[PDB]
Structure formats: C-alpha cells, structure tokens
Write a protein that binds this ligand. Structure first.
Ligand SMILES: CO[C@H]1O[C@H](CO)[C@@H](O)[C@H](O)[C@@H]1O[C@H]1O[C@H](CO)[C@@H](O)[C@H](O)[C@@H]1O
Length: 158
C-alpha cells in the first residue's frame, strides 16, 4: 500500500509524510462553504490485492492557521460527515485494487461571524490529515501524514 499526490509526491510502503498544495475559493462570504476536496489530490492503491485487503481510515484531522482561527467546519469521509477537527478514528475504507483510488476526504468550512479580510493566507498550513492504513494479513499499522497548504489567499468580504 502506497499513496501519491496529484502533483506527484509519493509516500511509499510503510507510511511517511507529504505536503499537499490546494487551490481554494478566493472569495467566501459568511454563510458559504469553503470546500477543500482532497479526493482529487490524494490517491492510493493496494500493492497485493490478489491475497491482501488494505483498510484505510482517517485517524486525525487537525486545523491550523487561518482555518483554525477563522473557520468552523466538518469533514466528509467516504460519503459521511464527521466533526472537524476530527478527534477519533473514522470507519475504514477498503482498497482492494492495484489501480489508484482516491482518498475520499473533503473539508467543508464556513467562515465565522467575526471573520473578515484575508481569512486564509497563501502558502500557510491549514490542516494536517493523518491516513492510517492496515490490512487483513499482518500487523501492519502505517501513518500517511498529509500536510495541507493553501496555494492562494482566501478573502472574506466585509
Ligand atoms: C507483496 O508485498 C506486500 O506484501 C508482503 C506480504 O505479503 C509485505 O511483507 C510487503 O511489505 C508488501 O506489503 C505492502 O503492501 C501490502 C498490500 O498493499 C500492504 O498490506 C502492506 O502494508 C505494505 O504496504
């Protein structure tokens, strides 16, 4: 089991960490949702699907920078909503193919009432998403750490 980003950064067998730079809606109003869809940026595959089945959870979702300070939101994992920050390991997603399959994570953030101006600064850390991978074959327990960075400013009009 290994994962790669749309840009090309790979985390090999055994886990690791990588940086993901995401484009963001450049304007968001109070009452609107800023969507961070990582299912288009992070992909994974099962290296030995003929005999092994890999299981993948969202172990932890942390908020940073302007997202931590100016936003409140949820995380959508494999079609279901969970609190963000995610404080407990989610249910499992099955990876049973060698062809790359997206990691179905997406953040839905809304600006807080007091937000205004540059709510997210370009190049800043906004989130860390930890992908925990196991299997039905041995005791493998690997963490794929995804550091989510904003490519551009996100402004809240005032
Ligand atoms: C075939 O190589 C994989 O399987 C053997 C055991 O059959 C492992 O010892 C080896 O490290 C490889 O495991 C990788 O791929 C597995 C299936 O994707 C995954 O379950 C492992 O955690 C590891 O990534």
């Amino acid at each position: 089991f290994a994962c790669k980003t749309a840009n090309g950064t790979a985390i090999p067998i055994g886990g690791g960490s990588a940086n993901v730079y995401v484009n963001l809606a450049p304007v968001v109003n109070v009452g609107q949702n800023l969507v961070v869809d990582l299912s288009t940026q992070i992909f994974c595959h099962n290296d030995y699907p003929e005999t092994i089945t890999d299981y993948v959870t969202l172990q932890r979702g942390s908020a940073y920078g302007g997202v931590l300070s100016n936003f409140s939101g949820t995380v959508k994992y494999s079609g279901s909503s969970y609190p963000f920050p995610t404080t407990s390991e989610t249910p499992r997603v099955v990876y049973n193919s060698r062809t790359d399959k997206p990691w179905p994570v997406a953040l839905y953030l809304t600006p807080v009432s007091s937000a205004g101006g540059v709510a997210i600064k370009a190049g800043s850390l906004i989130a860390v998403l930890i992908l925990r991978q196991t299997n039905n074959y041995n005791s493998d327990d690997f963490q794929f750490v995804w550091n989510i960075y904003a490519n551009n400013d996100v402004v809240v009009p005032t």
